[PDB]
Every structure is written in structure tokens, then in C-alpha cells.
């Protein structure tokens, strides 16, 4: 199966051209990609979706060396190594990828994101889906385990129904930090709607 | 303040007018308050905008807004494309009206099997913009309006939805349905044993 490669961080004509010349294609999104090529660990839709799916996240050297070979090389030795952001964000990329490959982080979760949330709900929905969760199109009316509402102060006036039925009201960082680290921990991210 | 999505042509003047008049540029149709375009097209951007019922307007909206000095009401600037309204058999104004009443896929739950074209994540964006739920994996149980969009490559994986009576549908159920704002699964049922 020919790689569908996504680029992010660097506008890299030589790399893109090498993908095509080697018989691969360029990916339109991280959700479609087989491989992500990048320089650093970043909290972006592209990086978080790639990580949530557990696809290879590789340096530009993969294509540099593949171009010399004349064919796509095995990905293993080209994994992104960013000790600085690993320290600063408190996770190991290899370990996070290993977790994602065993089971996607949000399997079993149903998540509604209220309209005023930042980052924008549709971007949050893309990340939720790439982590195997269900992005809900409207506010729930009933309780279910692992059904949660990502919300914000602007939207507290609209939260009486989820409060009524005991659905957790969570910070958007539940998703962003959780997906980055591949660890879901709703409790520290519970909002205070009356304050 | 409007968040305006452009699609079709790079319209630098139009983009500046948006910024000057107190708006911003939208990153996607799912985020936009307004879509500016020349023609009716079957694209993720156009279909998402239509599913959401947002104004879909010509380049003249911003041209006249810039001349007037403020964002004009959208009503007079709706895209008029009689040719594509023919290629596709629908009225854009009527479709927008339908979308504003109720989103097309309210109550639907849709799984798209991995081999489908256009790609599942794009189908998922459209499903969500039409008020449906895009499912992350194959269902195991029957529910009304729970359907599976699939394809010949994926027929070998369809025993469970067949077992429980979930419809197996063509991707055009979505694409044609959203374009027209009419959801009619029957014509789109696939034949998995052939």
C-alpha cells in the first residue's frame, strides 16, 4: 500500500516531490494520512490527529534517505525525537504512540463541544474522531458513562441540562492535553459553572 | 462579526474587505458564518455550508459591502447558478430554506467503511455539518436511521450490519442528499452479494 504522506511545520517541496516520485501521494488531512512528516512535537490538529491514530510520526530524514534509496524505507529509525517538548509537555512520543496503537484513547467516549469553546468545536471534533470517540451534534439530554460535555464560561448559561443529568463539564484541555499524552483523565479538567 | 469562507478563486480584494469591515477569514465551512463562491459545486466546503444553512453568496456581496462601507444583509447576494441547478436538479434557495428549518441528518447515525470514496473523514465532516452523528466504528446493533455507507471493497466486512438489518448505502446517499437537502436511502441501497 502506497504511503499517503502529510507534511506540517515545514513547506518542503523536495520532500513532497520525493513522495510523488517514489509512488506515494500527498495526504489532504491527518485523518487520511498513513504517515506524518514533521520537525517537532506540536499541539496542532494535524499532529494530535496523527498521534491519536498511532500513525508513524517521522522526521524529514525519512524522505531524505528514501530518495537516496529510490524507494520508501522502513519508518522505525526516523521517528521524531524531540526531548525538549517531551520534557516540557511531560510525555514520551514513542510511549504515546504505543498506547494509541493498542487502543485509541477515546474509544467509548461521546463528547459534545458547546459552540463558544476555543479551540473551535469542529477542530475538537476532528481530534475526537481520530481518537476513536464520537463527536455529538447537539447537547445530550441523558446520562451515560463516558458521555461528557466540553464547555466554557460563555456557555455556562446553556449547561442546565447536562448538570441536571450529571454529565461532566470539562475544559478543552481535557482533550488537547489528554490526546498529546495519550492519557484521559477527566477529573482535573472539571469546570466550575457557578463561579 | 462575519467569519467568511472563500472557495473557488483566490480573491485578495474580497479577503481584505472582510478584514477592513470588521470580519475575519474562516478556516473551514464548519466554522464560517458566510460562504463566498461563484458556482454550485459538490465540495466539502460547499456541502458543509449548505448543510448548516449558512448564507452562500456571490463575490458581489463583499464588492458592494466595501463600496457601501459596511457588511450588507446577505439576502440579495445568494449564489445564482441556473446551469448547475440543472446538472443537479435542485434549487439552492429551496435547499437553504430546508436546511434552516431542520438539519438534514438530525437523528441519523452513520458509519462509513474504510474503503469508501470520497474518503470517510470528509464524509464525516459533511455528516456532522448536517446534524448527524459520524460513528467511529462499525455498529453491532439495529437502530432506526442508523446506516452504513460502504463500497464493494468492504462488502467482506459487512456481515454484522447485514445480520442486524442496518442499511448498506452508496456514498451518493450523502452527497446527493445534502446537495438537494433530501434524505432518501432506498435508491442508494447496495447489493453486497454481487
Residues forming beta bridges with residue B189, ordered by sequence position:
B169
Superfamily covering domain B101-194: BRCT domain (3.40.50.10190)
Mutation to test the B interface, candidates A44, A137, A138, A144, most B Cβ within 10 Å: A137
Beta bridge partners of B109: B133, B146
What are residue B112's DSSP bridge partners?
A: B149
Best of A49, A111, A122 to mutate (most B CBs within 10 Å, chain B) = A122
* Grid coordinates belonging to A142: 441523558
Sequence-distant (6+) residues with CB within 8 A of A100 are A51, A52, A53, A54, A131, A182
Nine-digit cell at A138?
A: 447537539
Three-state DSSP string of chain B: CCEEEECCCCCHHHHHHHHHCCCEECCCCCCCCEEECCCCCCCHHHHHHHHHCCCEECCHHHHHHHHHCCCCCCHHHECCCHHHHHHCCCCHHHHHHHHHHCCCCCCCEEEECCCCCCCHHHHHHHHHHCCCEECCCCCCCCCCCEEEECCHHHHHHCHHHHHHCCCEECCHHHHHHHHHCCCCHHHHECCCCC
- Rounded CA-CA distance B52/B179 in Å is 12
Structural domain boundaries in chain B? 1-100, 101-194
Q: Where are the alpha helices (DSSP H) in A22-134?
A: 45-53, 61-69, 83-89, 93-102, 121-130
Partner residue facing B121 (CB), from A29, A107, A136: A29
- Closest CA of chain B from A9, distance in Å: 17
Distance, in angstroms, between B122 CA and closest chain A CA?
9
Of B28, B103, B128, the CB nearest to A135: B128
| Yes or no, beta carbons of B133 and A137 under 8 Å apart | yes
Whole-number Å distance between alpha carbons of B167 and B145 = 9
Kindly report the CA angle at A159 between A157 and A163, in degrees rounded to 5?
Answer: 135
At B57, phi and psi to the nearest 5?
-125, 155
CATH 3.20.20.105 fits A1-101, yes or no: no
Resolution of the experimentally solved model in angstroms: 1.3
Phi, psi of A166 (to 5 degrees): 80, 25
- Determine the CATH number of domain B1-100: 3.40.50.10190
Local structure of A177: helix, strand or coil: helix
Is CATH 3.40.50.10190 the right assignment for the domain spanning A102-195?
A: yes
As given in the structure block, the three cell numbers for residue B77 are: 447576494
Q: What was the structure determination method?
A: X-ray
Closest Cα in chain A, distance from residue B95 (Å): 20
- Chains A and B form CB pairs within 8 A to the count of 44
Q: Torsions phi, psi of A21, nearest 5?
A: -60, -30
CB atoms near residue A81 (< 10 Å) = 11
- Given a contact cutoff of 8 angstroms between Cβ atoms, the answer to whether A101 and A112 are in contact is no
How far apart CA B18 and CA B53 sit, in angstroms, is: 20
Amino acid at each position: 500500500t502506497a504511503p499517503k504522506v502529510l507534511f506540517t511545520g515545514v513547506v518542503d517541496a523536495r520532500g513532497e516531490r520525493a513522495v510523488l516520485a517514489l509512488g506515494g501521494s500527498l495526504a489532504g488531512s491527518a485523518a487520511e494520512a498513513s504517515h506524518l512528516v514533521t520537525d517537532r512535537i506540536r499541539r496542532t490538529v494535524k499532529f494530535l490527529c496523527a498521534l491519536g491514530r498511532g500513525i508513524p510520526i517521522l522526521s524529514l530524514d525519512w524522505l531524505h534517505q528514501s530518495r537516496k534509496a529510490g524507494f520508501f524505507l522502513p519508518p522505525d529509525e526516523y521517528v521524531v525525537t524531540d526531548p525538549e517538548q517531551e520534557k516540557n509537555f511531560g510525555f514520551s512520543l514513542q510511549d504515546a504512540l504505543s498506547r494509541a496503537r493498542e487502543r485509541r484513547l477515546l474509544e467509548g467516549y461521546e463528547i459534545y463541544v458547546t459552540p463558544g469553546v476555543q479551540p473551535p468545536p469542529p477542530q475538537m471534533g476532528e481530534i475526537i474522531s481520530c481518537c476513536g470517540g464520537t463527536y455529538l451534534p447537539s447537547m445530550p439530554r441523558s446520562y451515560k458513562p463516558q458521555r461528557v460535555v466540553i464547555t466554557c464560561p460563555q456557555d455556562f448559561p446553556h449547561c442546565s441540562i447536562p448538570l441536571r443529568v450529571g454529565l461532566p463539564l470539562l475544559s478543552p484541555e481535557f482533550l488537547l492535553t489528554g490526546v498529546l499524552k495519550q492519557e484521559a483523565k477527566p477529573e482535573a479538567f472539571v469546570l466550575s459553572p457557578l463561579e
